Amino acid sequence: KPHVSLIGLGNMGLAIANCLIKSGCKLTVWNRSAEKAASLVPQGATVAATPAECVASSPTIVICLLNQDVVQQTLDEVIDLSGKTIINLTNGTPQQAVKVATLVQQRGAESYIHGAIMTTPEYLGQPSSVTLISGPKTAYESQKELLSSIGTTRHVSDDIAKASLLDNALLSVMSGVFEGWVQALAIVGAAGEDEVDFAALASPLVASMADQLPVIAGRVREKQYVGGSPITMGLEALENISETSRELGVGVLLGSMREVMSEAVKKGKGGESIAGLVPMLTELDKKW
């Protein structure tokens, strides 16, 4: 059986551990809270006392910690990475991926690849569950069979930072959808409506909007901001969402969207489509 080490046994790390044991790995684990390995012990996992001991146990090291600062802290006293391949599945920024890749290279690592898991723990290991991988193609090819334990991989780039770039863009879309969905369900529930019946009404209309995301992308690329749905009109609709909510005693999200649309109107872009908001963001480092 191939020896694999895993650092991190949180919600996603434990799911990774179970996938690696099911695929036939000899697994060594480490977690700050060592008790999170308990369900792995009857399955034959070994628990390392320290990160260094965990890394010493295997030639392939998978990491899945909260963030890349925690990865750097955890690898602090891991002096010898010669012969080791690092597979980092920890969310972070593009430059954080560069920082961790450089750290492990300085300690003699053979390769670093980054992955962004685009599913939740309970679906990890299913073929529909995608993980985006970035890093040298030779390293991806060497790890692809091990990685198939967690589902389908997609090699998106040889640049080690690109999985995190794409992760952050995809999680932006997901965060916006969830912000809008939480607002919608708060309104519907406070009004005495049934959330499940509402979802049956809303899901197909969301599917339609999903099919326009590509249309918007092309217009953004081509700087085409003229259409039939101007920002002034969308902002009026958002102000009515606030008031609908307030009347029901419900709080309101979507404030950054109101603020960037309001400023677009002040700047003379009120007749533009929401594509016109993209340059509002790219031209200024500001939290709206």
Added chain:
Amino acid sequence: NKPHVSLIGLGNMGLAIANCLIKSGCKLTVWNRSAEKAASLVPQGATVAATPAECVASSPTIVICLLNQDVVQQTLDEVIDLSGKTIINLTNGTPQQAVKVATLVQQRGAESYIHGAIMTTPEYLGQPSSVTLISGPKTAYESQKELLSSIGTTRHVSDDIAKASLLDNALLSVMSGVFEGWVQALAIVGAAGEDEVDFAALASPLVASMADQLPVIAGRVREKQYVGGSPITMGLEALENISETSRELGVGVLLGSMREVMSEAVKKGKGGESIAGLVPMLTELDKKW
């Protein structure tokens, strides 16, 4: 002969309604504050009324599509007599605004008032895939159903006049969040030198995974089930990394209300809960996040 219909409002959506009503065979009379927006309708046989009152006198059915319900109310200050008139109001507004305008139209003697929420853009109006939600008296809806088929498929959601606007506001909340996240995503990948169209293709099946989990979250919200494998603490860390990814590229960042409500959920002891746990954050407190 062609049935007479009047339309108040010739903006982006009002002009698209006008064209649909003309294509379906109506004798259309229109009014708009900026009267020149009727110019493309005149060669098609539309009549232009001087005033809102003259527009309403011209037909038994009056469609309204104005910016907001305050503009509808300002226009109704100019319309005293709605005897023999059915009003179809397709103006976005709040549930209470719909109740108020229904009362104003009743005081003017209207036969009926129905409210509609158009859930598409102007260029798609008239397609049978395009949905408009309708609320108000079912007899009035059934009498207007053939006329309304000019703008696509209608769905009568409730006899309660406020319901189309309640559902519109909730659906537009979802759409606004989708757009907010998509603008952020496109700004990041554009600034990074990536192609937006290729990103949309890469994103397609992943956005699909996201859109199938909306009914799952709804059921969890209804049943108050907030425990899962994707805690708010972890999601908040990912959102903080979106801000820093954006800053590394010189790009601004949206999603602030989401970061704020999630931070407060952590303060209230809900950091281990799922997204569904944010819904009671909103229903328990009138606050702008």
